[PDB]
Amino acid sequence: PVNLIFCYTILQMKVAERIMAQHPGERFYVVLMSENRNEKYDYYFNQIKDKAEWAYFFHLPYGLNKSFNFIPTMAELKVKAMLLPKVKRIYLASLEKVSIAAFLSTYPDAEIKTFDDGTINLIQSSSYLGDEFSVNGTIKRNFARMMIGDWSIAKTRNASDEHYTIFKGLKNIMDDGRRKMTYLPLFDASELKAGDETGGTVRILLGSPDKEMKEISEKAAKNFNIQYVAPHPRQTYGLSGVTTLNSPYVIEDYILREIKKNPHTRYEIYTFFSGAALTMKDFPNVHVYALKPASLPEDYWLKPVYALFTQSGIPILTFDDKLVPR
Amino acid sequence: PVNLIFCYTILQMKVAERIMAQHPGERFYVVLMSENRNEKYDYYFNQIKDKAEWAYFFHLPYGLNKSFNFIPTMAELKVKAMLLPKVKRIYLASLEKVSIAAFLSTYPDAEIKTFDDGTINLIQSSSYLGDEFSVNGTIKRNFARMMIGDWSIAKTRNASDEHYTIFKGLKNIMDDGRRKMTYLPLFDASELKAGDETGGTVRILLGSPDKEMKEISEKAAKNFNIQYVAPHPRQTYGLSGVTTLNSPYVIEDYILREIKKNPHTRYEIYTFFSGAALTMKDFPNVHVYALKPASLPEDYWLKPVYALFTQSGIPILTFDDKLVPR
Ligand SMILES: Nc1ccn([C@@H]2O[C@H](COP(=O)(O)O)[C@@H](O)[C@H]2O)c(=O)n1
Ligand SMILES: Nc1ccn([C@@H]2O[C@H](COP(=O)(O)O)[C@@H](O)[C@H]2O)c(=O)n1
Numbered sequence: 001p002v003n004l005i006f007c008y009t010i011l012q013m014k015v016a017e018r019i020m021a022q023h024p025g026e027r028f029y030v031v032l033m034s035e036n037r038n039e040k041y042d043y044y045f046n047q048i049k050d051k052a053e054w055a056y057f058f059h060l061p062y063g064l065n066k067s068f069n070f071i072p073t074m075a076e077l078k079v080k081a082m083l084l085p086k087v088k089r090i091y092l093a094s095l096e097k098v099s100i101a102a103f104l105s106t107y108p109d110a111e112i113k114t115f116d117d118g119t120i121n122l123i124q125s126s127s128y129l130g131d132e133f134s135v136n137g138t139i140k141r142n143f144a145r146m147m148i149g150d151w152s153i154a155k156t157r158n159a160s161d162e163h164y165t166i167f168k169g170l171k172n173i174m175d176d177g178r179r180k181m182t183y184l185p186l187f188d189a190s191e192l193k194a195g196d197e198t199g200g201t202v203r204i205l206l207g208s209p210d211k212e213m214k215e216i217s218e219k220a221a222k223n224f225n226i227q228y229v230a231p232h233p234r235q236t237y238g239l240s241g242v243t244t245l246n247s248p249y250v251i252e253d254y255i256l257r258e259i260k261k262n263p264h265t266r267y268e269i270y271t272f273f274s275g276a277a278l279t280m281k282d283f284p285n286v287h288v289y290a291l292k293p294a295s296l297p298e299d300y301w302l303k304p305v306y307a308l309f310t311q312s313g314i315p316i317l318t319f320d321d322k323l324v325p326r
Numbered sequence: 327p328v329n330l331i332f333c334y335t336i337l338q339m340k341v342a343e344r345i346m347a348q349h350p351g352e353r354f355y356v357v358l359m360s361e362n363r364n365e366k367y368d369y370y371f372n373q374i375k376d377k378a379e380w381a382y383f384f385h386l387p388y389g390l391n392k393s394f395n396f397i398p399t400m401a402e403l404k405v406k407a408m409l410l411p412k413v414k415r416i417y418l419a420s421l422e423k424v425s426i427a428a429f430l431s432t433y434p435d436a437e438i439k440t441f442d443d444g445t446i447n448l449i450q451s452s453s454y455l456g457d458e459f460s461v462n463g464t465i466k467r468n469f470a471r472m473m474i475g476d477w478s479i480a481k482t483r484n485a486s487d488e489h490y491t492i493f494k495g496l497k498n499i500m501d502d503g504r505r506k507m508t509y510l511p512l513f514d515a516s517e518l519k520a521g522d523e524t525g526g527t528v529r530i531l532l533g534s535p536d537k538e539m540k541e542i543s544e545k546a547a548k549n550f551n552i553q554y555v556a557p558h559p560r561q562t563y564g565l566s567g568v569t570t571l572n573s574p575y576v577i578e579d580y581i582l583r584e585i586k587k588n589p590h591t592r593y594e595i596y597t598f599f600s601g602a603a604l605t606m607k608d609f610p611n612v613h614v615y616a617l618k619p620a621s622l623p624e625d626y627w628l629k630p631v632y633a634l635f636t637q638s639g640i641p642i643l644t645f646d647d648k649l650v651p652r
Contacts, residue, residue: 002411006418006426010559010576014512015441015490019417029411032591040559056387067421067476069444070601072469074626075538081465085328085355091345094394100332103425110330118395139407143398150393164341171481180426186340189551212401233336233366250336275396300400324350 002027002053008034009069014054020051029054035062066106093117094163094174097154102159112160114174115184119275121165121172123304125151132303140302167278170308187252187279192259194284199264205242206251206271207231213272214239216293219324226270230254251276252283259285273305277314288314293321327380328353334360335395339370346377355380361388364482392432419443420489420500423480428481430484438486440500441510445601447491447498449630451477451581458629466628493604513578513605518585520610529570532577532597533557539598540565542619543624545650552596577602578609585611599631603640620646 003026006018013032020028025034030052032045037059049055054144065085068076087107092100094114102110125148127133133144145152155176175181205221209232220226221242229242230251247254255267269295271277277288290309292301309316331342339358346354356378358371363385375381391407394402400618413433419439430438451474459470460563489500490510501507514518531547537557546552547568555568556577564570573580578600581593595614597603603614616635618627635642 001414004413004418006416006422008419008422009444011444011492011512012419012441015492015510016417018512019441019490036560038559039574042574044576061382065425067424067446067472068422069419069446071445071449071628071631073536073628074465074623075536077465077469081468087330088327090330090332091342092330093334093338093395095395096332096334098393099391099428102425115338115345118335119397120393120395123397139400139403142407143403146393163347166337166341169582184341186337186344186346210399210401233364233592234362248365249364250370270553296398302397302399305397 002029004028005030005052007032007048008065010040010044012069013048016048017051017224020048028052029056031058033058033060035060035064089113091115094121094154095150097158097160098150101153101158112158113162113164114154114160114179115164116166116174118279118309119167120147120165121174122170122278122308123147123302124171124173125176127304130303132299161179170278170311187256187283189256189259189283191261192256192284194259194263195268197264197285199262199266201266201268202228202258202262203268203270204228204245204251205228206269206274206276207235207239207244208272209234209236211237215326216272216295216321218242218321218326219321220270220291220293222326223319223321223324224270226323232274251278255280255283255286259283273301273309277309278312281312281314290314290316291319292316293319295321328355330354331356331373331378333358334372334391338395339374342374343377354378355382357382357384357531359383359384359386361386361390366617366623387561390409390544390615415439415503417441420447420480421476423484425477427479427484436631437489438484439490440480440486440505441490442492442498442500445493445604446473447500447652448493448496448604448634449473450497450499451502453630456629458625474483478612496604496637497578513582513609515582515585515609518582518589520585520589520611522590523590523611525588525592527592528554528584528588529594529596530554530556530571530602531565532602533561533565533570534598535560537563541652542647544568544597544652545647546596546619546645548652549645549647549650551597558600578605581606581609585609599635603635605640607638607640616640616642617645619645621647 007013007016012062016030030048034041045057087110089111091113095117128144128148133140138303151173155178161181162182164182165172166184166186168183203226205226207229208217214237217239218241227243228245229239230245267286270291273290277290280286281288331354333339333342342356356374360367369382413436415437417439421443454470454474459466461467477499478581481504486505488506488508490508490509491498492512494509529550533555534543540563543565546568553569554571555565556571593612596617599616603616606612607614
């Protein structure tokens with residue numbers, strides 16, 4: 001049970017020290033946010049870093065703060081004023097209307113437009129009222145409560161007149177009658193000259209970013225005879241007995257480049273319900289399968305996941321991972 | 327006249343590229359905010375950085391984001407939940423209630439307390455209605471408008487029950503009847519054993535953080551025979567013909583240490599209206615003078631500055647800088 005202290009000046013750090021010294025029995029995490037760093041800032045930061053359970057120094061880009069902690073001279077006012085970019089329009093993910101609300105408010109005349117955060121935009125508002133999310137005190141209830149509040153603020157504050165979605169024919173939580181919905185297809189699969197699948201079959205597993213899925217992933221590769229794994233961008237551990245594809249690309253861009261080079265190859269993509277199944281479903285010579293390991297509870301994935309996959313015509317394969325050695 | 331784009335994922339960067347490519351005649355500044363960095367993130371960031379007029383990659387500390395751009399598994403939900411510190415209380419500068427509003431809202435049950443941002447807290451609410459600030463279209467009007475809105479949100483949203491001020495006997499803008507006001511004296515000048523000023527006189531100029539004040543500062547040093555300059559923590563240029571004090575301390579802490587070592591020395595502090603005049607006024611053997619250079623317009627400092635200095639018994643010296651060579 002901790003106390004937070006946020007500072008953006010040296011004198012504020014000195015106030016933080018006095019507050020901490022008067023509460024010697026309490027835990028403190030202290031964050032300094034500053035556009036300046038030098039031995040004076042460091043000296044006082046290190047003093048706090050010595051007294052606090054945890055301390056972090058965010059070293060910000062110059063000019064982010066349009067107000068003033070001190071009383072400005074006309075010259076300081078004039079410099080700040082004419083430093084400030086003129087902003088006609090802001091584009092951001094729909095939930096960044098929540099997390100960067102405060103910054104949006106400083107450009108009330110800017111036109112605002114949003115785009116999908118990710119597959120979180122595919123859960124419609126009613127689903128958060130589902131029984132799955134209505135046991136009190138559960139992690140699932142708190143998640144839904146958080147999401148209901150965030151979508152409400154994203155939809156009703158700082159009016160934005162347009163929303164870009166990358167998902168064709170799937171209802172968006174941002175489709176609420178307050179804005180224009182625009183389909184923006186990310187991936188051009190038109191110029192590939194794909195032909196009949198008369199070459200080999202290449203099987204790729206989509207890596208999970210979660211280390212706990214490691215054993216189930218290795219078993220999937222063995223079970224379905226998958227030679228390759230495309231690691232998740234946030235994935236940080238390795239799979240054994242599978243060849244890892246090392247590439248700067250995300251899987252969709254990697255696969256487009258492969259289809260063009262290999263227009264007769266059958267590509268099969270195996271995934272524990274990755275959003276990539278939804279962006280790739282209509283790529284030529286690409287065949288996507290979701291894997292549902294039997295050793296996981298049925299509710300390991302939220303119910304809207306299963307509905308979205310079957311609505312998208314993606315097969316869901318029950319995989320008896322416990323029948324696979326190691 | 328620019329467009330801003332805020333992204334926190336790779337697919338969002340790919341949406342940003344499509345938006346930019348459809349607006350080839352427009353200017354774009356693009357900000358990526360991410361807890362992850364690797365060759366996939368870098369690859370797509372560099373693509374944007376090549377197409378945008380300006381791009382910045384804020385590499386955030388892990389765990390700052392409590393929501394999800396993708397639909398979470400029960401395991402992802404559980405990990406996030408039990409990563410999250412339990413927060414009983416948050417302390418921040420009064421105007422950080424504005425700039426970190428969004429983060430405060432994620433701890434609605436936390437007790438909130440504030441402290442002064444700096445001398446900006448000494449301008450009372452009525453002064454922002456002064457004639458000085460009511461010419462339309464002026465930089466001074468826009469400043470006051472911004473400040474009226476920010477103080478209103480700091481006072482009336484995210485209720486905070488206490489405010490710490492470091493200034494004794496000066497009315498705080500946060501003294502609005504909604505909170506307890508607490509005087510928190512930063513500086514202990516009790517154990518110094520200062521005696522009669524029977525030694526020499528040491529004169530120190532407070533450096534200005536603004537490069538344009540350089541010539542006026544050098545002239546002050548010559549005019550008043552000031553041997554030393556204590557540079558402002560944000561000060562980044564040098565003064566010629568004056569000895570610069572190089573120290574990790576801010577001036578108040580430096581001066582306390584000097585009085586204790588030199589209990590018979592007279593210290594005189596000369597300043598272009600630094601907030602340090604207000605924190606130091608009652609230090610023993612410390613004599614503060616504000617300098618008002620004749621070559622600057624009378625309204626170079628805002629009127630509340632002059633009133634606060636004279637209310638604090640700090641002499642204001644008219645300095646005819648144009649009468650000083652070089
Ligand atoms: N193994 C994986 C999984 C996801 N991804 C990328 O991450 C994007 C988001 O996937 P998720 O919603 O599963 O996190 C996918 O559309 C794809 O571009 C990838 O490149 N490789
Ligand atoms: N030349 C200066 C000016 C200010 N300062 C520090 O900066 C604090 C804030 O000063 P201003 O409000 O002028 O920016 C002062 O109280 C003092 O601690 C300093 O150490 N040396």
